[PDB]
DNA sequence: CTTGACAAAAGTGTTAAATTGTGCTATACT
DNA sequence: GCACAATTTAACACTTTTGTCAAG
């Protein structure tokens, strides 16, 4: 069954949540678009900007660019460790400046990575993703002076690395000094070549007041542009001789140059309608015939001098406002790095033509690859806006794509963000998620996009709304921009709508994000749905209005930390968005047209569509991902049936029948249990392990290379000198582990053979070698044995030796072997578990179904959660979720409660009265009545007034059952618990963190080469660190030796650790260590500084800490 | 002259104390110049040297204790009289 | 908890002096394999096991029970550091 | 063999540093692009800092502890432990005296 | 306990002509009840074969002596057009709950263990009411209700 | 910790340092931690 | 300078510094010989005074020298000492150690204030030097070497060890530390009671002193080898003993949450 | 292959600012505690296993394996040491090793160290 | 325990091949 | 970038030492 709630019906569905990465990239592609009629922006803006190349003399020019079909498919590029890219050819033309001879000759550029279907590229054969960036929009802005109280400082900024910053700060003088790139020069100076002398510096200046005279100088006002041009040029550039034309050609590129100053279209546009003038181009000025014709600097003062005065219409700007901030998308930065990388090619063009043979030349010799190729390869890897894709689950990538980072190269950093770039701005609303953000020190720094929010070309974010005329909801769907919002007066979706009309005379609305009571007349707009007010994950939280942001945060992020499940199940209570989730995430299979299933075959599902053509949709079963989480697609259809286009043919890794399914629904007991649920801990029932609940699959990657050393080349084989038939078992033939065989922690996956560097065996060892006379083979075992804790089966063999077709290997490498390892992990003791309400916890000791708090129907609960972190963390969501689950158990009907619009107390109360009326009736019918124990509980509960006195047990237990609570019998004792205990069906999730992978320890491991300190981390096979904090703690205890143990024998000491493993292994007490050896190195390092460090004893006497070493 | 805890941490006796604190470059200079020898009086000024902490059980008060059982105690109780007769 | 701690702490003036005593004495106990000490066969700190119940090899505990009786003598500059290690290595192999 | 209770710090002098060094590193090279052995005067040169392998001279005429400390008459390397390369410093003789940026800035 | 199929390398493998993977087949193999007509047996080996377009089930097995399926309607796998599937299992009898990870098989090349749910008892619920059958009052009438599958009768339980 | 006169050879400085060092994470809600630093 | 897997090499920045120094100091020595003009000398000699200083404090003068193509500043002598991760704070006043490890934490209701669940596996590799000798004494393998290979290879961990390890465990107690380490009580000494599973059990009361809860928090464990140190671990560093707050003077491990509610 | 230059040990690894590439390199140029204890067990067990041999062959044995002065002495030298021929010493070794063979095939103390 | 006879292994000497270290060119160009 | 002297290396003809076998 299915049931939904809320009276708010969305008019416009959720636009594809995956287009923000795909569409914005698509525009900058123009792959389908013809070479003649294109859009000029995006990637073709990189060619037309860096062209024509002009400089005895030459003129190149851009014409077109072709999109090379991908050299290899997705899969191939993945298993080859090769970037999923494709050739970009380009046709330009090399023309002589004098000869008038034309030479065209198309050339090559390089390989530009293409985006996949989901929206994530493949770099170096790895699945990565480009996260969105955010920074203030270009233009003019005015704010109060950080120094002076009584004024406002204007400013101009184009784009990061597309031009310099501009600020006008009036120093406390009474005169004015503009500042750019760290320097202060008279604002009046700048007007030199700008075309403004004395009489011009007054005409609009006196239109204000006291501010005229600080803008009139004399000492430099006498001269004219070509003089004072070199004047400020000698100052701002004291690196080269103060020449004349060098002050023209220099400053020409600081403003007038449209190619050296790229002011984003948003800047030109917005700053235009801001100041009250208009610009021709994207530039601050114009190189017009010698001198410089003004464009921006004149209108930037007609505002900056107006506001400071106090005239209406001119005012300060909101720095943190969203209409003043844009979003750098994929098709943006990709193009930026493409052009700035292409200019590095343009210079590699201007150095080749100026020499050699200026007669015989073609662009075929004048271009280059690397200045561009490397420029792109750099961005797609090292930049902060490109990291490892989140494949932890389907919803994971879908979130990771819609994430907006304020960090990155041209963003901000953890230093300069106090509050401003963190805090939630009034305008955020239906654009940025007010809650979802990392719980660490990055809170507010990186948020996500709103489910209905959109980003236009300019970069601003527009949120959906609905026009209304006098209590009439219009079908008009307006995407209002950030600034557009502050104008109109918007209502809410929870407003009193009676049949497309307003009901109450006092309706909820606001202005600039300011809630106020409003009339049915003055309502200009309305909200489409409360869903837009939040993000995706946040919208998957039912009864979210009953909880707190703090917990909602985790409640969302953990869903990303979630893992698939073999038996996975969608919640019996959702918000109803899961449907669009499984589709828009493109993790499942649907019907493109109206077909009929020809064959099931959990490998290939053939469907011959009504169009008559036979089309099959091959499936990917059990395939590794980034976090190790399997990718499975379960076929749902018969051997044949006809379906309609859009119908699901196969599930996803996390999907159930087209419903996002994270964890599972179990029977939760809210009650203290012998302090095992202590402090947000979790207990569970063994009965879950039977049905294979919360049991997933994981895969791991293992590879090895055949290196060719100085001595000689190595190789993969089944031959090992000292090996025994046992270890050589699972290796089939060529000396690799077979498919489907066990691998214990320390089993040989793939054997390798190498020639050890020849070194005479030690004398004792030569004798031992002389007893058994074992031949000392040149070659020694180089093999690769799976690390500890990692074990399972083997579902893959991929070996690529070099010199093979379609595979390029690193120089000096013969072959490489890659094995996959599958693991079926069952929910263990201590593994992370959480719900949708942000309640974390680990598994503390499961428990035999035998002794469990069951019910009169002999149904034992599955968890027993602690009723403590509810009143503190204040999340009542899990309470109502479980409350509905309690009835939904007996009715089996799946509920859908939309965010901030859903089932209320009366509704659920009704469902409980219903569920009880049939449940208790099943007891009456089955030949029973009210249990004595139940009578006991009803009584002692009646004494406290939990059930209205004077009513029969049927009605008392009816009021209780509907309250969310019932009678529980302890499987151990058999007696009923004192008070009633709430229970029901709740959705829980087995998170990423697994004890199996997070547990570790060592005794004697490897040591750092520099200092003999033990290695850290896990994989390095090393021990933990003893912080200064720990050292201090031990000092506070007073443990002298225990501290020294941490500082000598167990860390960097040389002879000490050896005398430890020596003594202990024989029983003697550990000797007294000496030199920490980190200190010896410290001393020698100081010696390198010509610092004489001398150790003394008890009387001012030399002490040699280096035994016979440095003595000379 | 009262000063901040930091100032007092850098103005301390041993050089090794402030050396591991901060502004190291400025410490070593002023140290080596006057050629100051640390007495390892402070604990952290010792931890650096990888030695036994002047406090706790390693204290210069309680680390000088000795333990003897009755039988052996009397066995050495005779040892002192074996030098007066020999 | 370590039984006797209230009494142990109540013996020495300091805190750590107790540690120095327990430590050095336990050292003497593991050096000679318990054939030095002041405990009778019923005082011996036995360790129960599925196999057999022997005397607990842990020297720390042995030293505990040792000092708890008071049969031991401790102090600064008690006896010359020479003979103290000379006759201790003699009486027992 | 003796207690350590005190640690001094002084200014090292050129004539002192000359005493520290086991040789002047001349050739600013690391190692041969083929043999991977320390260059004749290279900053890693065994002939001054020490053997790369325990109790083996470079050329390999003295291969055992039987001859300890005896300097090789062929390669010029002192046969000893390979650990000595962590405590044996070098020096570079400057044609023109220079100051230490520390005291300067 | 034990399971094997002609073409399988592991519990995740996919056999042509089958709708589900091996693990979904095991998901129904754990729900498979088979009684022993003899108290003296310590083990057995069930055999199964299916060709053509047919839905395999616990009743499709190869009947033998001392064996009876109590749920012939238990859906195992759906064989599509021409789908050929051979299968065999060893259903041993035991006590308690031992996951496959604790018991080996070593039957042959690919011998895949499975979890063991012995406990033929599904659920048990007892109720204590007020009995009318004795001298005094406030006495109890114990009523114990037993729910088990096919392997053993409630009375026997 | 022992509700008895402090033992000789005690590290009490480090003790104090920790004693006031722990609460330093709860002073958000007065002049708070900045005052403590200011003092 | 050493090579790693794959064959590629590696080197310190101070090497290239110590090199680019000698180059100039050499060329100069050739010029002061062959009779070259004062301009070239004064300039060449300038790059000597700056290079030398670059090997000392790199960056206190001008833009720091970096390997060509990269923006990564070369680390000089002074760069190693000063700083958070410098040879003082990271390799002297704290360091990675031997005989240690860590894992997730789980509640201890059946455990006394002196007890903790220590993972079966984790304890074996923690006490390996001990258990080796315990296997020496207690038959099964002739000697030390035997025990080693008899353990490392093959999870043959049969009762021969699972018990003997308990024999070396009894008495001495290990230490558990929860980060951050604020209160010294954030490191306490507990009895190593071998338990099934990878998790770690801890007493619910003192769990407050560690500022810990079981939401998936993780703790580290070490073993105090020296009997002298072991004494310290049980006498002062023991949890059972320190029940009071060294800060407030008021008790530390006391009823909490559930307990309070019951009582 | 020879073209490409070394790699800066200061190259930060991972997405953090606190990580380096240097520390991720182990140390093979120095004996591990387990290796010291290993070579100790061999140097010991071989000593006691040596004691069970003829006085002349016990010496001649460690003269041919370089266990005495660290250097190996050829038959020509051993024969000049005792006064026998270079033929006698040769046979002496044959019967020597093969004589310890019997005790080793039993005690199994040194059956280890087989890598 | 010891000879004499031999083949394999380790020397010892002179070469052919290769690998590496150097000086240098000329329209003019600052 | 190249002709080429400089020096290193692998090349190889062949002498002497050292492990070794059948027979005293
Ligand atoms: Mg926690
Ligand atoms: Zn030599």
Author numbering:
A (entry chain C): 2 to 56, 62 to 1118
B (entry chain D): 1420 to 1505
C (entry chain E): 2 to 94
D (entry chain D): 2 to 106
E (entry chain A): 54 to 210
F (entry chain D): 1210 to 1238, 1253 to 1262
G (entry chain D): 527 to 789
H (entry chain F): 324 to 438
Relevant lines from the article:
CarD, first identified as a regulator of ribosomal RNA (rRNA) transcription in Mycobacterium tuberculosis (Mtb), is a transcriptional activator widely distributed among bacterial species, including Thermus species, but is absent in Eco. CarD is a global regulator that is an essential protein in Mtb, the causative agent of tuberculosis. Crystal structures of Tth and Mtb CarD reveal an N-terminal domain with a Tudor-like fold (CarD-RID, RNAP interacting domain) in common with the Eco transcription repair coupling factor (TRCF)-RID, and a helical C-terminal domain (CarD-CTD). The structural results, combined with supporting biochemical studies, establish that the CarD-RID makes a protein/protein interaction with the RNAP β1-lobe, thereby positioning the CarD-CTD and a conserved Trp residue to interact with the upstream edge of the transcription bubble, using a wedge mechanism to prevent collapse of the transcription bubble.
To resolve these ambiguities, we determined crystal structures of Thermus aquaticus (Taq) transcription initiation complexes (RPo) containing CarD. Crystals of CarD transcription activation complexes were prepared by soaking Tth CarD into Taq Δ1.1σA-holoenzyme/us-fork (−12 bp) or full RPo crystals. Analysis of the diffraction data indicated high occupancy of one CarD molecule bound to each of two RNAP/promoter complexes in the asymmetric unit of the crystal lattice. The structures of CarD transcription activation complexes were refined to 4.4 and 4.3 Å-resolution, respectively. The protein/protein and protein/nucleic acid interactions were essentially identical among all of the four crystallographically independent complexes, so the more complete and higher resolution CarD/RPo structure is described here. The structures show that CarD interacts with the unique DNA topology of the upstream double-stranded/single-stranded (ds/ss) DNA junction of the transcription bubble. CarD interacts exclusively at the upstream junction of the transcription bubble.
